[PDB]
Amino acid sequence: MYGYDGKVLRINLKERTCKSENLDLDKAKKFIGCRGLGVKTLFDEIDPKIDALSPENKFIIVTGPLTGAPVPTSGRFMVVTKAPLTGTIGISNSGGKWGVDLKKAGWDMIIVEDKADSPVYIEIVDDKVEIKDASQLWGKVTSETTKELEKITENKSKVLCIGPAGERLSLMAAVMNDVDRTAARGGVGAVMGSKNLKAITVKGTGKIALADKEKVKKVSVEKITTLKNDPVAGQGMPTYGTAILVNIINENGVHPVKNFQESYTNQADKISGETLTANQLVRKNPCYSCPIGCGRWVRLKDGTECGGPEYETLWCFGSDCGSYDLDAINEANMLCNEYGIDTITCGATIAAAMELYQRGYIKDEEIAGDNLSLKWGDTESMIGWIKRMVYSEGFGAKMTNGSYRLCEGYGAPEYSMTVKKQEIPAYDPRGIQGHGITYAVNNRGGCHIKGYMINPEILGYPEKLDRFALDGKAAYAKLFHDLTAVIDSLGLCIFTTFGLGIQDYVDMYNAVVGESTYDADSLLEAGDRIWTLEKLFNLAAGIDSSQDTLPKRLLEEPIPDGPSKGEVHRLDVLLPEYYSVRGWSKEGIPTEETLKKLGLDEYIGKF
Ligand code: SF4
Ligand SMILES: [Cl-]
């Protein structure tokens, strides 16, 4: 077909079968692709109440119709499965090259079922698929796993894999691809580990079918020109990476410090993208077909070269732990990529532990055997905790599954900066009202990128809003939630929003898939359908709307100092308005009229 390949790879690890199925084009179009196609597939094939580490969970790797097409940022794909860290839907995105090889191999999506009786890996070369013994790879870090597979797979194969953390079912385990790219949050890597799946190698020799090659080329050249002319997409991101945000968020007084105890630090420029570019940066590391190139390639203190850190990583191993050692952040990022864990949950769990120590919940005797401290700014101890958390060594075992469970153990849940048990990232919502809505209602838990209200409230895209204001924020958050669901579903990068809007996405989709398949209104409505489908999945999984909240600190403790001094998030007023503008009930339940309007009639009367 055009855009979509038309084929799905179903792999049952108990029966050790690899079978081809025809893609349901109607469903793939109705849910756009990638995210939406994966969630609908999972919802249709599992009971959401199941334990996410049970063999009955499904591990889905899905691409979008634009994944692999000659358009800007077409290297994106997603992992969809029940998320074991949160109990919610798991929707984790990754770039690099792996997903493009899968699409060039003729597959739009892989559904992995059940569990292998021993560690295995999947080897794909176009339509050739084999399950093989992975006993000699089990236990190896991402880089070594990749090098070992390169010795026994076809040249040019890309590697997707879990590290030791995923093998041990850590709830902060990530899915790694291309050595340093990752579908990281939700503990999705532990689902792969629960299936005894160590890796999937993929080589694709095909091309993505285009309905109109020359039109696609004309549309692509136009969008790239806009991105290259945009100050952020054309200059800031390529030069400083996402790390460009350090000084921006800090100057607005919404950069979390010491586990959100503060919101501003006069040391932030030591870990800025400007400092990184002037020192350890070797070069950009752009994903497939990407003119932005925000990817970082850096030099570790020992001279080793490797993928560099993103903004959220610079924050969680820097300001959040009271550390301002940039070399150390580069090392921590490498260690998280090698062990296969989400940087954000890792650093913010260490930050929660440092606060529990600050407040006397953790005693010196409990960590003496580890020979590490939990003192703010102790960079060496912070780095040392990573390995101990991954392998459950000494006190590290209490941090292996995240801050929410760690703080519950000490009877101090108030020190876990999480929503649905997932750690909130590097933006203090007390000074960003619309963005705080995203954190509270995000279907995948505490997360900023499924609703980056940072764009309009701080960066001025597509317009500048007053971040302290309340009027209009609920509706704006809904729009960003639905637009992000479209971009995730297409197989493109969210950073295209630095220059592009809905019509640009319609232009690229129609040029690739077929003239007039979607219009700006129908496509955004599809994003609303996808977000609402995720909500129904969470309701079926037992995730009540009462889990739409923020830590008490962010609702009651005014920011103590800085440009946002005095502010708290006003969720009490914004959440009901968010449900209302979504067409949901006061208990956050999609109404019968809303389900009919979104084409979700099969779910009427069930919630
Ligand atoms: S903007 Fe960055 S994350 Fe997005 S596709 Fe390009 S290099 Fe990758
Ligand atoms: Cl679960």
Residue numbers in the entry: 1 to 607
According to the publication:
All these oxidoreductases contain two metallocofactors: a [4Fe–4S] cluster and a W-containing bis-pyranopterindithiolene cofactor (simplified here as tungstopterin).
X-ray fluorescence measurement on protein crystals confirmed the presence of W in CaAFOR and the structure was experimentally solved by single-wavelength anomalous diffraction at the W L3 edge. However, the overall monomeric structure is highly similar to the structures of the homologs, the AFOR from P. furiosus being the closest. The W atom is coordinated by the dithiolene groups from each pterin and by two atoms modeled as oxygen according to the electron density. The W–O distances in the CaAFOR structure are, however, substantially longer (around 2.2 Å) than the W=O double bond modeled in the structure from A. aromaticum (1.74–1.75 Å) or detected by EXAFS spectroscopy (1.74 Å). One of the hydroxyl groups establishes short hydrogen bonds with the perfectly conserved glutamate (E312) and histidine (H448), a position that should be occupied by the acetaldehyde and acetate molecules and reaction intermediates. This suggests that CaAFOR was crystallized mostly in a fully oxidized W(VI) state.
